[PDB]
């Protein structure tokens, strides 16, 4: 993020409304369709 | 009967160097996957044609300009963007267009679409939001086949010649060695053209060699499959017609003119 050098604690502003990565409806874990609307949480993709 | 009016909510924070560049492009054609009344500036940008997470070639755009509904930009205010659909049957009154193609459209022609199959697109880089928008060229319907075939023909030779309209010739070379990228930005199309005419000039000899383990009734089906599945993507048709009343007859590039619906 370009404002990485701008914000001090940008942890709180990136922990809320991530978009879903995988498709929630197929038999396998496909990639999300180009226009899905679901939203999830990623406590692990936050702290790596 | 009302014109199918679309609105694209231009976000804030667009630096005036970009709002100053969105004005001058009023009357250019854009595509939508599905057609709504409220769109988004990302539903127009280049990131819509991503197939394998990467920008599209000059082949994927040939299907995109046959599967995504088009819409002509009608008017722009500094707040938002307004455009009218064209393909469906709607009475849209004004419906002008600005010729964005290196050619002069004579009066009473028919217009088809074409991705920038030569050179760089005079696009718009909205850096304050992180996306790029590309606009298809508006070439006449008679110059379609010549251009789409000559661009492949001048590439197969480099892998191994001028267009002219309204009495004015246009050197396609543009005086520079475009041999880097353009032979790979068109790679997917020329490579699919090889193995569909290379199969053609052999199976005819295979059937009856006296005209002048390798299933026959599988390849005879894999040839009519491909040669016909491609027989529409490259053979596109007209969508608009350049009609003028009490105005000029020829429209130089960059200048706008009125059109009707096919």
């Amino acid at each position: 993020v370009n404002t990485n050098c701008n914000t001090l604690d940008r942890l709180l502003m990136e922990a809320k409304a991530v978009a879903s990565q995988s498709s929630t409806d197929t038999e396998y874990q496909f990639k999300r369709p180009p226009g899905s609307t679901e939203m999830t949480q990623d406590p692990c993709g936050l702290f790596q | 009967a009302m014109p199918f009016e679309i609105e694209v909510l231009l976000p804030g924070e667009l630096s005036p160097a970009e709002t100053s560049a969105l004005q001058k492009c009023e009357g250019k054609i854009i595509t939508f996957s599905t057609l709504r009344h409220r769109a988004s500036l990302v539903d127009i940008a280049l990131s819509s044609y991503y197939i394998n997470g990467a920008p599209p070639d000059t082949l994927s755009l040939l299907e995109a300009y046959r599967m995504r509904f088009a819409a002509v930009i009608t008017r722009v205010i500094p707040g938002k963007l307004l455009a009218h659909a064209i393909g469906v049957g709607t009475p849209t009154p004004g419906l002008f267009i600005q010729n964005t193609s290196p050619v002069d459209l004579c009066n009473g022609d028919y217009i088809c679409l074409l991705p920038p199959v030569f050179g760089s697109a005079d696009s718009i880089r909205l850096d304050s939001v992180g996306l790029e928008i590309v606009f298809p060229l508006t070439i006449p319907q008679t110059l379609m086949r010549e251009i789409i075939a000559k661009v492949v023909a001048r590439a197969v030779e480099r892998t191994a010649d001028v267009i002219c309209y309204n009495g004015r010739r246009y050197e396609l070379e543009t005086n520079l060695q475009h041999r880097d990228g353009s032979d790979a930005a068109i790679r997917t199309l020329v490579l699919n053209l090889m193995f569909s005419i290379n199969e053609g000039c052999l199976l005819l000899l295979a059937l009856i060699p006296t005209l002048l383990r390798f299933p026959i009734y599988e390849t005879i089906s894999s040839w009519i499959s491909t040669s016909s599945r491609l027989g529409d993507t490259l053979g596109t048709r007209a969508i608009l017609r350049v009609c003028v009343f009490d105005g000029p007859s020829t429209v130089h590039p960059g200048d706008r003119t009125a059109v009707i619906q096919v």
Partner: protein, 48 residues
Amino acid sequence: DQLLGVLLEKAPPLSLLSPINKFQPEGHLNRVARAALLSDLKRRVCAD
């Protein structure tokens, strides 16, 4: 006697109606949600 006999041949089980009652909103569950609900249906029968 007939009223009991008619109410009885009409009442689905409780362990099979309470879970599907918890998944009523948009009760046309996609292929994945019914498969994830059946795993709880099999479990909530043996427990009670």
